Ligand SMILES: CCn1nccc1CNC
């Protein structure tokens with residue numbers, strides 16, 4: 001059972017107001033046929049337009065909420081809404097567009113999906129709360145057939161052009177008019193009681209309902225993300241590399257060792273309380289400090305309450321607390337914190353549920369909304385590079401580095417050596433990479449890098 005069988009049953013109750021008299025007994029085979037499509041018994045990689053929940057989760061980057069609301073049905077104009085906030089009006093002659101014929105509307109759909117998805121995924125997955133008109137309107141902008149490759153590259157074809165009779169991926173589809181071999185999933189098939197708004201509003205207060213198609217498309221995809229990533233967590237699913245994943249992760253490890261090593265040297269804490277990932281390793285293995293670990297998985301729903309993490313059914317005020325990607329409601333004053341900023345715009349960070357975001361880097365992690373009040377007892381950690389390694393070149397060109405934040409023996413004694421200048425510029429690069437990826441660094445208010453210069457005597 002790799003793909004969804006076309007002979008699987010489809011509950012049609014959600015479709016009977018737009019489609020009166022719809023048979024209660026219905027398969028994907030008959031539904032696809034009713035949508036105007038013909039599969040012709042094809043063993044060419046596209047077995048079903050509809051996919052399983054497991055296949056949807058593996059392709060979460062391809063999710064596009066899609067809803068159709070009749071304005072006035074081949075006689076009436078339809079309002080097409082996408083979770084990108086777009087609203088197109090198609091006439092059969094929250095960005096709102098006036099009524100236009102299908103032949104131009106379809107050109108807009110290809111442009112929009114291609115610009116949204118080219119850097120996220122090899123496909124589109126239409127996430128639906130199916131009532132009828134979205135499924136019947138698909139014949140006006142979708143073409144299906146065997147799996148194909150792009151005319152200009154080796155990626156799979158996601159668009160077709162009737163003008164040139166050719167196929168293209170999301171990167172080479174300028175001027176293409178048809179969505180080719182899209183996927184889709186109906187959230188109503190998962191077994192919900194009540195309408196979309198009642199189920200969405202149980203977990204999310206950020207998305208409202210103006211009553212436009214895009215508000216529904218947004219609520220649909222948000223509810224799907226809550227079911228698949230907030231209340232159900234699968235950290236075994238691996239996602240492909242689509243950007244700077246490897247560099248961001250390497251940078252995170254470099255920054256962690258640096259910031260923690262310098263806090264232990266500056267304030268000489270006797271104990272460090274490492275709260276977070278149960279698979280954590282000591283980031284500063286040579287530090288003298290008593291290292292104590294506390295297990296707390298990444299919270300995907302609401303941020304951890306510090307009152308529950310610290311409750312003993314043990315002296316957290318002694319030494320320092322390390323919360324590296326451990327999202328709590330209010331950090332204690334003696335803390336070193338890395339907190340992912342859910343507001344960040346990137347190909348890795350997808351929109352989420354209740355203000356949160358879906359950070360996808362090797363694994364998918366729904367992160368609770370960034371909250372500035374979490375850090376009231378702390379301050380923003382400033383950039384600095386620290387090194388006690390010998391000043392020795394070994395082995396790229398050079399311009400002399402002058403910086404007040406290069407905390408080294410060579411800078412203390414006047415001129416920064418070539419080694420520490422190379423290492424400083426590489427560390428600053430990793431630092432900017434981690435910050436731009438969305439991570440934010442916070443530290444206890446007494447943290448002062450002036451205390452690092454005396455470690456050179
Ligand atoms: C470190 C505090 N502690 N002791 C037992 C269990 C826990 C965690 N909070 C529930």
Ligand SMILES: [Zn+2]
Nearest residue numbers: 150153169172
């Ligand atoms: Zn291409």
Ligand SMILES: [Zn+2]
Nearest residue numbers: 204207222354
């Ligand atoms: Zn929502």
Ligand SMILES: [Zn+2]
Nearest residue numbers: 391410417420
């Ligand atoms: Zn040096």
